[PDB]
């Protein structure tokens, strides 16, 4: 539903934590946690933000932030 992971393009597109954050907020997203090593961030996205963000030149992927459990 609302919890997603936004994958970034780096030489296809995006680098800074401040650019990464603006790329989200530009499409009505709300940036959660900007990853250290992984070129991605957790974001709060409506259905509009998922489709707008899927088409952005700076975006590699928009995927749901899935639930894991202890086995």
């Amino acid at each position: 539903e609302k919890k997603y992971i936004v994958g970034f393009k780096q030489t296809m597109s995006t680098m800074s934590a401040a650019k990464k954050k603006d790329v989200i907020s530009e499409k009505g997203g709300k940036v959660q946690k900007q990853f250290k090593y992984v070129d991605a961030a957790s974001a709060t996205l409506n259905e509009k933000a998922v489709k707008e963000l899927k088409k952005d030149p700076s975006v590699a992927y928009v995927e749901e932030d899935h639930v894991a459990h202890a086995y």
Binding site: K3, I5, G7, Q32, K33, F35, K36, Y37, V38, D39, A40, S42, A60, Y61, E63, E64, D65, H66, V67, A68, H69, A70, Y71
Partner: protein, 264 residues
């Protein structure tokens, strides 16, 4: 006192040789580790559950239990509570990423993930892949999904090519009925009626692939103590190659882990 599964994996003969996991930093990426347990030595940690800030409080029980399996296998190992899961035993894939990421940052030798989900993540792949590229032995529970016809029932992260996906065997080498199957299945370790440490200065049997997983993260720590110069690549190949060979790789992977054979 010493859990049976320790013996089954041939942990006791490695111990005698003098190898106990000395100088190995092991991340338990779980629900935390209970600080109140007089039998559990925590080297540090971090929490990634937004509402549960202390890695040292386990409101679940799973991470305390897992942690006690690691330290039974590898008693001289350095344990770290990486809290990724809340009270209900669930966390977000991002929270798991943030845990992996601290383990990369903290110069963790071995990651245990006694968890998963049904659905893939590109970000979950990037985080495991990077831990592996960084030289971390990445160990994960295969899942508790049984058999689903022809399909892989292997959860993520264990489903990833970079991770060592661990199914559960009982005391008689028989695959646990709950034990997730598939091509992504790497090794079997004891996962049936596992006595480990539980919250509130307790002991108790748990069953799950989450019980098999720590036996392999403890085995990687024991090899690393005998072969400090071995890469994650060498640690994994030796573990997969020196197994007590069981049936079909789809059900059993390579077989049961033999730490003594694996250690060289």
């Amino acid at each position: 006192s010493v859990p049976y599964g320790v013996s089954q994996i041939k942990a006791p003969a490695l111990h005698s040789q003098g190898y106990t996991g000395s100088n190995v930093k092991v991340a338990v990426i779980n629900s935390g580790i209970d600080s109140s347990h007089p039998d559990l030595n925590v080297a540090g940690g971090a929490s990634f559950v937004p509402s549960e800030t202390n890695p040292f409080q386990d409101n679940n029980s799973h991470g305390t239990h897992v942690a006690g399996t690691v330290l039974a296998v590898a008693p001289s190992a350095s344990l770290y509570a990486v809290k990724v899961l809340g009270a209900d035993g669930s966390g977000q894939y991002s929270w798991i990423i943030n845990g992996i990421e601290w383990a990369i940052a903290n110069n963790m030798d071995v990651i245990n993930m006694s968890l998963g989900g049904p659905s893939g993540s590109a970000a979950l792949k990037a985080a495991v892949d990077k831990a592996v590229a960084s030289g971390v032995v990445v160990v994960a529970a295969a899942g508790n999904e049984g058999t689903s016809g022809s399909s892989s029932t292997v959860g993520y992260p264990g489903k990833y090519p970079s991770v060592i996906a661990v199914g559960a065997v009982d005391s008689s080498n028989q695959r646990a009925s709950f034990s997730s199957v598939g091509p992504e299945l790497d090794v079997m370790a004891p996962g049936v009626s596992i006595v480990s440490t539980l919250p509130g200065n307790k002991y108790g049997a748990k069953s799950g692939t989450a019980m098999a997983s720590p036996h392999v993260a403890g085995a990687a720590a024991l090899i690393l103590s005998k072969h400090p110069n071995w890469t994650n690549t060498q640690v994994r190949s030796s573990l997969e190659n020196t197994t007590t060979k069981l049936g079909d790789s789809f059900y059993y992977g390579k077989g049961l882990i033999n730490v003594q054979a694996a250690a060289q």
